[PDB]
Every structure is written in C-alpha cells, then in structure tokens.
Design a protein around this ligand. Structure first.
Ligand SMILES: [Mg+2]
Ligand SMILES: [Mg+2]
Ligand SMILES: [Mg+2]
Ligand SMILES: [Mg+2]
Ligand SMILES: [Mg+2]
Ligand SMILES: [Mg+2]
Ligand SMILES: [Mg+2]
Ligand SMILES: [Mg+2]
Ligand SMILES: [Mg+2]
Ligand SMILES: [Mg+2]
Ligand SMILES: [Mg+2]
Ligand SMILES: [Mg+2]
Ligand SMILES: [Mg+2]
Ligand SMILES: [Mg+2]
Ligand SMILES: [Mg+2]
Ligand SMILES: [Mg+2]
Ligand SMILES: [Mg+2]
Ligand SMILES: [Mg+2]
Ligand SMILES: [Mg+2]
Ligand SMILES: [Mg+2]
Ligand SMILES: [Mg+2]
Ligand SMILES: [Mg+2]
Lengths: 218, 88, 129
RNA sequence: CGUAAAGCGCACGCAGGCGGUUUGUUAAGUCAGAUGUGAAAUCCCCGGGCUCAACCUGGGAACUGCAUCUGAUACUGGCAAGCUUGAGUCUCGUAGAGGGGGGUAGAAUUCCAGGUGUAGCGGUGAAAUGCGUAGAGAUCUGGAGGAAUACCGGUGGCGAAGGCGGCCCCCUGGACGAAGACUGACGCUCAGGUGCGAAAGCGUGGGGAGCAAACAGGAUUAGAUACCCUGGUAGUCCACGCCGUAAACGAUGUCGACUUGGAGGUUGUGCCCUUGAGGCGUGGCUUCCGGAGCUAACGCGUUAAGUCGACCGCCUGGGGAGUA
C-alpha cells in the first residue's frame, strides 16, 4: 500500500518503453509509478541488502546528482559503508589498480594537512595544496577507506549513473537501483521503480536502506 | 459518374430485387452503362490519357466479372450477354 | 495476398517470441490447431485455445524457461512454391534428435519420431528446435 | 541486387506460377506393403588361393528407377455444396497544382506613335564592342503582341510513373471517412503483348515578347574554337503526327502478414455541457529521430535495408563494350 508519501512517479513522454509493467499512468500527461508493484520489490531488495550487510560487505551508494549528494553524506554515511556523491570518474572499479594510487595520494595529503608539511613554503604553494586536497576529497571521498572491490552497488538513478552500473555488470557485482520511468533496466539485478528526483522520496529510500544496514551481523 | 437516378434504375432492373447492388449482373450492368457513356467523352478530347486509365480499369473489371460468371453459371452468363449487348 | 497461412502462424510465433509477448493470436484453422496441438504436447508452448464460431480465433501461450525463449528456431520446410515429401526412411531429424520436425502423415499430423515409429512418411510441415 | 555487378521509367494484362475458410466425395500427387523387372562384371560387406599384396573368387547388399495389385486419407489436386474475414457494388459526404476543352484578369519585358528634356546611356574586376546630338538614356500618354502566373507557398497537396500552381465555366479519373445493405474467393503475380512516358530532337502548318545552342564582334590569356560583355538564328509557345530515352533515383519490383517508442504536418470522423481556440477516442496519407534486429561499414529501423510467404526482373573480375 501507500507506505510512501506523495511522489506518485515522475517524467512524462521521455519514458523508456521497458518500464511499461511498472507504469500506472493517468493525471495531466504524467506517468504514475504503480506503488503496489514497487512495495514487494522494494522490500525484497531491502531484504537482500540486509543479507549482504549481515555478511558485512560494501554497498556503494552513488548519488552524484546534487540535491541527493549530501543525503549520502548524511546518516547514509553513518553505516560503515562507502559512497560517491560527486562525479563518478570512469574506471573507479573496472581498473581499481590506477585509482589505488589516487587514494594513496589522498591519504598522504590528509596526514600532511594537520601533522606534516602544510605551512612550509610560500602561501601560494599552501593554498594550491589545500585546493588540490579538497579536489580529491570531493572527487573520491568515503571510498578512501575501501581497500578492495565492493560486494554490491546502490544507485539513486539508473540512466544518470549508467557508467557505474556498466562497470559493476562488467565485474559481476550485484546492483540495486531506483529506476524512474525514463530510466533503463536490464543493467540492474534488483530494480526499484520509484521517483528518484524528489528530495523527500530519495531520503525515504536512503533512510530505509540505511536502517536495514544498521543491522549488521547483529 | 452515373447519376443517382440512373444507378438506381439499373440496380432495380438487373438485380433479383431492390438493394441488391452486389450481384454480378448489377455490377456488370453498371460498368457497361458507364463505359458506353464515356465513349462520347473520349470521342471528343481524345487526349485525356489520365481519365482513360480509369476507363481501362472499368473494362478490366468487367472482363474479370464476366469470366467469373461464365465459370459459375453459364445460363446466367449468356442471358446477361444478350441483354447488355456485349459480344463475348 | 495471403498465400501460406501455416508460414504466417510460424512467423507469428517467431516474432512474438522475439518480442517477449506472453501470447499470440491468429485466425484459426484445422491444420493450425493440429500443429498447435503437436507443439503443446512436445513442450514448446504452454497452451492453446479457440474462440468464436463464425470467425474462430486461435490463441497460443508462449513459453520462456529463463530470460530467453524456448522455441529457439522455427522454420517452414514444405511451402506452397515447393512442397517436400519424405519416405519413412528419409524422414529428417533436426539438430540430431533434439527438437522436432512436424510431419503430416496419412494418420494425422505428428512429429518425426512418432511417424518413424508408426512406419510411414508424409509431408514435412516445419522444423522446430 | 540502397552505395561493391545486379529492380525493367511506370502501369494494364493473356499464357504460366501460386491461392482464405467448413463439410462431403474421389484417390491423381503423397505415404505403406507386396509382385515383376532393374544382365554379368564393377563399387561396398562377410573367406580362401596364388609365400603376402596386387589379382582371381563364393554369398549378400546395392542398383536410390519403372510398371501393376492391394490399402491409408493428414496435406496438395479434381468434383459438389456452403461461409464471410480477402476482393468488389450501392447510399451520404470530404480535401486536392489529377486530366482534357473554352474564356478571362493584373503586374512586368519588348516594340510602335507622340510629349517634356539634354549629354550621355549600357556594361565589367577594369575595359571595349554597342546605343546617342538624325536627340538616346530618364519621364509621361496611347496602342500592338507573345509568354509566364509575385504574394498565398508550406521536408504542403494530387497523380502509376513522367508530372501537375492566376481566376471562371464545361466534360472527366482516382483516393479517403460514417453507418448499413449487397455478391460470395470473383484473389496476388505476370515472360510474350498492349498502353502511357521529362528535356532535347524530327515532319507539316501557325506564332514569336523574353531567353538563347550555332554564329558575329569586344575582352581575358602565353594561347582561349571557353568562362565574362554586346548582339543573335534554330528552339523554347500552339495543332496534329513521330521519337521512346534521363542521376526516368528512394540509385530500394509488386502483393500480404507480424514485430518496443518519441516529436510534427495534412485530411476525415464518434462521444463528452463548444458551456472560446477544450477533453477522450478512431481512420488515410506524410516528415524527422531512434529501440531490437539487420548490415562490410555507412546506415535502415512499423512508409525496414527486421521476421516470413507468392510471383516476376536482373548479376557472375576490369578493359575491349552496351561496342561490332
Ligand atoms: Mg466507381
Ligand atoms: Mg559507382
Ligand atoms: Mg551499382
Ligand atoms: Mg523503380
Ligand atoms: Mg500488375
Ligand atoms: Mg486451399
Ligand atoms: Mg494414388
Ligand atoms: Mg548387376
Ligand atoms: Mg589369404
Ligand atoms: Mg565378388
Ligand atoms: Mg480437398
Ligand atoms: Mg514485358
Ligand atoms: Mg519538347
Ligand atoms: Mg517543330
Ligand atoms: Mg515551323
Ligand atoms: Mg551570350
Ligand atoms: Mg535506361
Ligand atoms: Mg525525376
Ligand atoms: Mg528526387
Ligand atoms: Mg536503374
Ligand atoms: Mg532512423
Ligand atoms: Mg547500339
């Protein structure tokens, strides 16, 4: 039933025909996602994530879309998990070897930021170092303490994070996605039909997934 | 094309009854009436190739209908031939 | 114009199968029903039904085992332009026994396996694999 | 067989090929068995003898074919009777540069006559040929004649293709939509055959303003049988007759069925208070983008170059040659 609030889908004609089974369709030329259909799938996905969390694996929230980013740095960051709230640089997963050096550089500069060399040499070299540091922080943040490939991915949007989904499929990593009417399934192992634009709705998804992952191995 | 009054006259005079516009005799009679009427039009002008293509379609349709009737019921095929004046 | 209704039935199945349709629908006929019956008993389709009386309509329910379809390839053999008849000893077998060849024998439509057991040949309607 | 060679320029159509759906009958095709025949050798499968092998040899199998007899009746064919979904007829309307004939209107170019007025006009990259003091060019008035129809105008419309634009009348072809009635497979394709078929070209008789092959002169150039300039004949126009060809192209034959979507144009129609130019549907044609699939790739993609069926046309390395 309507456990959610009032989002009733999104999008209009930019609709992917593969979403037909999940569409209700009605008011003022806007597609209405069939909430009755998503509730069982959403619960089924929540259960699988709970199973993975009990196994103590990673889930990799990604919500590059602003107005959804911080909500992964919110209590979504709480759980001992990892996120990518900014541009997903191509190759973050399919070549972990090269990005390994980038995180190593990030780690070294974080230490230097408080204990090492941060004041020596001209203020100009100080400010470039800091702005370079924050560039690494916001580009690859929570992912810093990962140290290996994940065990699952959680994507707020599918057609907007297609690069991440494709890399996961290439490496055989399960993918759980919130697919809108405009988005494309078949790259996702567990589809969750639901609006991915509304701030209220996306928080609802992140809270529910956050809550089920709070319960780790127990 | 044939006038509404003219069309009704042939239909009632060749069909088994009124509103029997589909019978082969009615169809052949209607084509024959229009083919004969157009002979005057093409005697004059004589260069209206685009309209003559419509006339040839009438001739071809009538030939096919007549062939079907001859194969189906010879007796009706004949009686129609003399009534309308067609050679073969 | 419509020259080969049987090939029409076969391609309707093929296209609907590739489009992931749940069921396909078509005008009915004795021969179509006989062929559909053989497909059902061989496990290539779920079921079939006929409706209406003056214009009977035949509907087939297609089968999927996994994400992919069940009827891998369905091909017409004896077509109106060239009809194929085989003796008992020349009956073909598709992909080495796997899959069937629908054959219309003097005792009705049946598979190549069934016809070979009954010891009589006939017209090769189609191949299914 | 879009671009590598290959869809006839387009139609109509005889022979031919193929053909919706139900019942009965026949048993020609088809299928089953049997009989006769299918020479021997050879080839193939099972032993010996030449010491082995080659070679010789016993028996079988095979000779895939033909004829006859006896059966089977699903499919194809024949015959008889049906059915309405393919095809067609009727009723009422809609849009359209569809076609043939006749009439007529306005703008403009040229020419002829006259007026006013005076030294240039025209042309080019620059010039010159050319026109002008015998009065041009410019400007105004009157008249003659031919050709084409600004704006509307629109990947707009119509036509089988070629193609078809002022307005009016006459004769005439097709397409589409609403609802109902009618016939009852009457269908699709089509070698040969027949018809239509841009422009140029040809014959006879007219007409002739503008434009303009050929031709003439002036330029450019090393040359310039050209590009540029000034003139200009056939032709372009009309009637009748011939020609039968084009990058006649969507470089894509016709017909039928099936297969996710998005945005437009144009033309019908049903219902809902039109309660303005609205809302919900349902047909025809048409443009652009794209999914699966297909493709060498480019790209095509419900108007397929996707998945299929029927028939036709055509290709088999380049040149010689679409020539003798
Ligand atoms: Mg008519
Ligand atoms: Mg070429
Ligand atoms: Mg070529
Ligand atoms: Mg063509
Ligand atoms: Mg034809
Ligand atoms: Mg039949
Ligand atoms: Mg027989
Ligand atoms: Mg012998
Ligand atoms: Mg021996
Ligand atoms: Mg021997
Ligand atoms: Mg029969
Ligand atoms: Mg010919
Ligand atoms: Mg000409
Ligand atoms: Mg002449
Ligand atoms: Mg002359
Ligand atoms: Mg000149
Ligand atoms: Mg040619
Ligand atoms: Mg052309
Ligand atoms: Mg063109
Ligand atoms: Mg050609
Ligand atoms: Mg396209
Ligand atoms: Mg020649």
């Amino acid at each position: 039933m309507l456990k959610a609030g009032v989002h009733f889908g999104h999008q209009t004609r930019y609709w992917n025909p593969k979403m037909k089974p999940f569409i209700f369709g009605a008011r003022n030329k806007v597609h209405i996602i069939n909430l009755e259909k998503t509730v069982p799938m959403f619960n089924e996905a929540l259960a699988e994530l709970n199973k993975i969390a009990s196994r103590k694996g990673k889930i990799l929230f990604v919500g590059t879309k602003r107005a959804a980013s911080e909500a992964v740095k919110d209590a979504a960051l709480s759980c001992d998990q990892f996120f990518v709230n900014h541009r997903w640089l191509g190759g973050m997963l399919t070549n972990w070897k090269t990005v390994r050096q980038s995180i190593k550089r990030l780690k070294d500069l974080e230490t230097q930021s408080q204990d090492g060399t941060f004041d020596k040499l001209t203020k100009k070299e100080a400010l470039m170092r800091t702005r370079e540091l924050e560039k690494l922080e916001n580009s690859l943040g929570g992912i810093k303490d990962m140290g290996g490939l994940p065990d699952a991915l959680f994507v707020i949007d599918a057609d907007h994070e297609h690069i991440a989904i494709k890399e996961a499929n290439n490496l055989g990593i399960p993918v759980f996605a919130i697919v809108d009417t405009n988005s494309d399934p078949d790259g996702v192992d567990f589809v969750i039909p639901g609006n991915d634009d509304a701030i209220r709705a996306v928080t609802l998804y992140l809270g529910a997934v956050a809550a089920t992952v709070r319960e780790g191995r127990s | 094309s044939l006038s509404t009054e003219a069309t009704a006259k042939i239909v009632s005079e060749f069909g088994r009854d009124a509103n029997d516009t589909g019978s082969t005799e009615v169809q052949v009679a209607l084509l024959t009436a229009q083919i004969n009427h157009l002979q005057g039009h093409f005697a004059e002008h004589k260069k209206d190739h685009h309209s003559r293509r419509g006339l040839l379609r009438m001739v071809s349709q009538r030939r096919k209908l007549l062939d079907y009737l001859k194969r189906k019921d010879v007796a009706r095929y004949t009686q129609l031939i003399e009534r309308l004046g067609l050679r073969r | 114009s419509m020259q080969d209704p049987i090939a029409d039935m076969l391609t309707r199945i093929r296209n609907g199968q590739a489009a992931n349709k749940a069921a396909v629908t078509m005008p009915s006929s004795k021969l179509k029903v006989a062929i559909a019956n053989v497909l059902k008993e061989e496990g290539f389709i779920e079921d079939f039904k006929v409706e209406g009386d003056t214009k009977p309509e035949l509907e087939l329910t297609l089968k999927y085992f996994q994400g992919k379809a069940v009827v891998e390839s369905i091909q017409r053999v004896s077509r109106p332009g060239l009809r194929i008849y085989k003796r008992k000893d020349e009956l073909p077998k598709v992909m080495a026994g796997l899959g069937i060849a629908v054959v219309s024998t003097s005792k009705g439509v049946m598979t190549d396996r069934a016809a070979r057991q009954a010891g009589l040949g006939g017209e090769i309607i189609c191949y299914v694999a």
